Amino acid sequence: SFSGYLKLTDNVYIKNADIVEEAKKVKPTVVVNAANVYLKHGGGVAGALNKATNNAMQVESDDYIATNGPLKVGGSCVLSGHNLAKHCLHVVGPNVNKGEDIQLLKSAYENFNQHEVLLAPLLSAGIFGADPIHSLRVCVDTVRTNVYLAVFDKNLYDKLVSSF
Numbered sequence: 001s002f003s004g005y006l007k008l009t010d011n012v013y014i015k016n017a018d019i020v021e022e023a024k025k026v027k028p029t030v031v032v033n034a035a036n037v038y039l040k041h042g043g044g045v046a047g048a049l050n051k052a053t054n055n056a057m058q059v060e061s062d063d064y065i066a067t068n069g070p071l072k073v074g075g076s077c078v079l080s081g082h083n084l085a086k087h088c089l090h091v092v093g094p095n096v097n098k099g100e101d102i103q104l105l106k107s108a109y110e111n112f113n114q115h116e117v118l119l120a121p122l123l124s125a126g127i128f129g130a131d132p133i134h135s136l137r138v139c140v141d142t143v144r145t146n147v148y149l150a151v152f153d154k155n156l157y158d159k160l161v162s163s164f
């Protein structure tokens with residue numbers, strides 16, 4: 001039920017929207033979380049998605065880490081989407097503020113190819129410190145499945161479209 005998106009390529013679409021509000025409206029099969037390896041959902045997209053689940057995402061995530069240990073940077077796991085989606089794909093992009101290899105951003109986006117359609121944010125952008133223009137380029141050159149990107153910041157959305 002996606003509406004109001006701008007088409008960038010055959011399979012990539014973009015909209016100026018809060019991914020939480022978009023998930024509540026659409027209830028997609030998969031919402032992507034901008035996760036860290038510990039699944040500690042404190043701020044940014046992860047903090048906002050978790051708060052919309054009334055902390056149920058963090059309780060589920062703590063049980064997953066207690067059983068499996070941390071994810072790899074560039075890796076992912078599929079957990080419940082709670083009241084927002086059928087599933088949440090938690091994907092770890094590199095955090096440039098922590099010195100992580102930006103080359104891992106392509107490996108992070110490759111996780112999206114296991115799902116036919118996804119609602120997602122730009123990986124490694126925002127508080128993860130990478131250039132969002134670079135993140136959008138890696139997304140369109142890596143993802144082959146249908147990805148609906150939600151960009152919260154209006155000024156960033158306008159810059160991403162104008163420079164595409």
Ligand SMILES: O=C(O)[C@H]1C[C@@H](O)CN1c1ncnc2[nH]ccc12
Pocket residue numbers: 017018019020044045048121122125126127150151152153156
């Ligand atoms: O604007 C953006 O593209 C990124 C980076 C930063 O502005 C935060 N953010 C988000 N993008 C989409 N839905 C969001 N919900 C909560 C945060 C958030």
